[PDB]
Amino acid sequence: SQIQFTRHASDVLLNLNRLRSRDILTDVVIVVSREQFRAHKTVLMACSGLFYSIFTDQLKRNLSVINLDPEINPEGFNILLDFMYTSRLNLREGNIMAVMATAMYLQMEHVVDTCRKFIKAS
Amino acid sequence: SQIQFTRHASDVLLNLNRLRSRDILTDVVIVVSREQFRAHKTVLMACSGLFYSIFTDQLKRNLSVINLDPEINPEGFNILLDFMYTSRLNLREGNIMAVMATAMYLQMEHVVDTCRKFIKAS
Ligand SMILES: O=C(O)c1ccc(Nc2ncc(Cl)c(Nc3ccc(F)cc3)n2)cc1Cl
Ligand SMILES: O=C(O)c1ccc(Nc2ncc(Cl)c(Nc3ccc(F)cc3)n2)cc1Cl
Ligand SMILES: [Cl-]
Numbered sequence A, B: 001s002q003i004q005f006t007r008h009a010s011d012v013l014l015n016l017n018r019l020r021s022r023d024i025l026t027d028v029v030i031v032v033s034r035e036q037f038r039a040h041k042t043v044l045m046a047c048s049g050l051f052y053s054i055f056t057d058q059l060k061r062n063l064s065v066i067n068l069d070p071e072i073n074p075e076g077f078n079i080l081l082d083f084m085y086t087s088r089l090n091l092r093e094g095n096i097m098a099v100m101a102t103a104m105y106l107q108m109e110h111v112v113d114t115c116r117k118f119i120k121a122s
């Protein structure tokens, strides 16, 4: 019977993205070939089956550096990292293939489904 | 513009609350009189002016224990901590005063405004 604040979840995500933009309390660097990206492990876990399966393991919990598969495109990863922190996906014809490839690797089923719905109406 | 995922923010907050429930990557303990509560500093900062003002300071960034004002009711605090992680506020006639007192201290303006609208509507 609790009071529902319908803007609170989007407000928290916006603030977490602002902390990321300021490098505040980011605890991991994601290396994607020649490019590197800082992030909060909790956010990565909250969005990705890959990152969830890594950091829930007490063996890997404390890793400060994650090297992604060499085949992953840094731009495709960055669009997905932006999606994690904003709820907005930069999808188009020019990147649909690399974006879907990365979302499949990161195990982000809703992005994969949306990529499959983008193809179906292309 | 970019594709909007209207459930993504809520999905991220639910997953952060599940991580809290499993004590995964919690990095602070909030001491409230005889009681203690573990949490993610990022989430506390994202929801509270108090915690944002403490942890944005490089001097205080790495604190692992925050002792709140002795007057703060642990129950009012727990209701607000649950709100931070769920977007749902447990307000009643029996706790409005302690929850409002706590939200003023924690600098959570939207909760303070809702507490002011609860009083105005009996
Ligand atoms: O769909 C299910 O059956 C299912 C239900 C609940 C659940 N719990 C959970 N708790 C905390 C986090 Cl941080 C999290 N992250 C996450 C995991 C896998 C992903 F592909 C994406 C994100 N998931 C996990 C699963 Cl796999
Ligand atoms: O009041 C304003 O005009 C204002 C506008 C934007 C802003 N930016 C911000 N970026 C990151 C985080 Cl984690 C955050 N947390 C937070 C801060 C103060 C609060 F009472 C609650 C939450 N706020 C801070 C303020 Cl103070
Ligand atoms: Cl997804």
Ligand SMILES: [Cl-]
Pocket (backbone or CB within 6 Å): B047, B108, B109, B110, B111, B112
């Ligand atoms: Cl608030």
